[PDB]
């Protein structure tokens, strides 16, 4: 999706394999502010939020607890108490088009700032200064939404970046590559504790 209308998926009451993520080796960014990524698959969390969207390489900086800029204050805000993992990766071969990818958009001209975890979908004529347009696209009356120019010629900081931010909260645990059970032998075991 676009960073202004970012998708959010609630994950609860299912069984989660966190090993696929931490051990995939295809991510440009893997920074966890809650519990370390290698020790993420044993903490029974409640709801797992999956905030998926596409931004630029310089805009990955704004996806961090307490940041500023277009994305942070006008599109998607990561709270200062974020206890999850920001997972970003370049998608120049997927979301970039020769001539610019205008399918992806971002809110720039927004009145105030954004709240932690808030979808900004206010798509109405934005009066910049003090010019009444009553819904007319013009000077000091431009549209707040702005398109992107994702291209292979774009540099890393302007290249498309798929970012799934994993927010966490007693439904999802693991791990220790559960050793297959053995039978009939007096053994030492660890059965779910």
């Amino acid at each position: 999706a676009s960073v202004y209308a970012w998708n959010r998926k609630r994950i609860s009451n299912c069984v989660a394999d966190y090993s696929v993520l931490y051990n995939s080796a295809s991510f440009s960014t893997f920074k966890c502010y809650g519990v370390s990524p290698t020790k993420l698959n044993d903490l029974c969390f409640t709801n797992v939020y999956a905030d998926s969207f596409v931004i630029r390489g310089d805009e990955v900086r704004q996806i961090a607890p307490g940041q500023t800029g277009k994305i942070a204050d006008y599109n998607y805000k990561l709270p200062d108490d974020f206890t999850g993992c920001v997972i970003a990766w370049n998608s120049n071969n997927l979301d970039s088009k020769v001539g610019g990818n205008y399918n992806y958009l971002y809110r720039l001209f927004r009145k105030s700032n954004l709240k932690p975890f808030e979808r900004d979908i206010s798509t109405e004529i934005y009066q910049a200064g003090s010019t009444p347009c009553n819904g007319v696209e013009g000077f000091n009356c431009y549209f707040p939404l702005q398109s992107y120019g994702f291209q292979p010629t774009n540099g890393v900081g302007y290249q498309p970046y798929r970012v799934v931010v994993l927010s966490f909260e007693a439904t999802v645990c693991g791990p220790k590559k559960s050793t297959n059970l053995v039978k009939n032998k007096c053994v030492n075991f660890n059965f779910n504790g």
Partner: antibody
Framework: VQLLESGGGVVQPGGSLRLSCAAS????????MNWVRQAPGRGLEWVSA????????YYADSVKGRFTISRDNSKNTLYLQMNSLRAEDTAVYYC??????????????????WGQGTLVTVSS | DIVMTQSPLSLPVTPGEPASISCRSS???????????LDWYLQKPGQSPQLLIY???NRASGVPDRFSGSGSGTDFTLKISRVEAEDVGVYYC?????????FGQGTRLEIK
């Protein structure tokens, strides 16, 4: 910005056709589109318009039911359904985008950018 | 329906001279929100039109400064400051208020 109109040619009286307006260089995701026809030496006359995401399918009387329109918001293309074509639709067809992207900028109103047009001829 | 009539049908004007094109609406095109929803187009010979005047009095991106629109309610006039050799072609007006979008019949400014 380019508005490449595809399809079009010689179709049969009462036959069928479908026209493609491949657009690029701009969003097209928050922009409305218009269809404009011009019979030979008879003036620009309106046909159709669509909203940002379809659903809003606005037609003139002469194209009531007989014409329908669609868009490919992923591939950024405009389409146009035709059936039982009469001799009065023999014309060159322009797909045109609305100025703009806010409300009260009517999706059937100002047309900033136009295409190159393709001739649709109904004869035998 | 909003049936619009242009005036006059033809304006052959020598280059360097000024020209005015008038097109009057049958109904009132004023204040859907406070503006005049009549738009002006030029179809130059052999190629497709683009906007000249939008909202009655204002023009789009990159238009020559010689073009200007005026009039309110039902009467509207286009005001060319100085006709030249690239200005040849038909002029259209359009009502942009109600869904049936009707254009004018076409008055050419030509060089006589």
């Amino acid at each position: 910005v380019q508005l490449l109109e595809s399809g079009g040619g010689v179709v049969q009286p009462g036959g069928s056709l479908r026209l493609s307006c491949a657009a690029s260089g701009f969003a097209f995701t928050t922009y409305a589109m218009n269809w404009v026809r011009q019979a030979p030496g008879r003036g620009l006359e309106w046909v159709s318009a669509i909203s940002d995401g379809g659903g809003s399918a606005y037609y003139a009387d002469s194209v009531k039911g007989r014409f329908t329109i669609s868009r490919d918001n992923s591939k950024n293309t405009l389409y146009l359904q035709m059936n039982s074509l009469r001799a009065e639709d023999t014309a060159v067809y322009y797909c045109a985008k609305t100025r703009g992207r806010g409300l009260y900028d009517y999706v059937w109103g100002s047309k900033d950018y136009w295409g190159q047009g393709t001739l649709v001829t109904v004869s035998s | 329906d909003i049936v619009m009539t242009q005036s006059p049908l033809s304006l052959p004007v020598t280059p360097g001279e000024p020209a005015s094109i008038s097109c009057r609406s049958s109904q009132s095109l004023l204040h859907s929100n406070g503006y005049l929803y009549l738009d002006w187009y030029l179809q130059k010979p052999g190629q497709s039109p683009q906007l000249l005047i939008y909202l009655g009095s204002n023009r789009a991106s990159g238009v020559p400064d010689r073009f200007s629109g005026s009039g309110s309610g039902t009467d509207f006039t286009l005001k060319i400051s100085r006709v030249e050799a690239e200005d040849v072609g038909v002029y259209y007006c359009m009502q942009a208020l109600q869904t049936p979008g009707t254009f004018g019949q076409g008055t050419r400014l030509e060089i006589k």
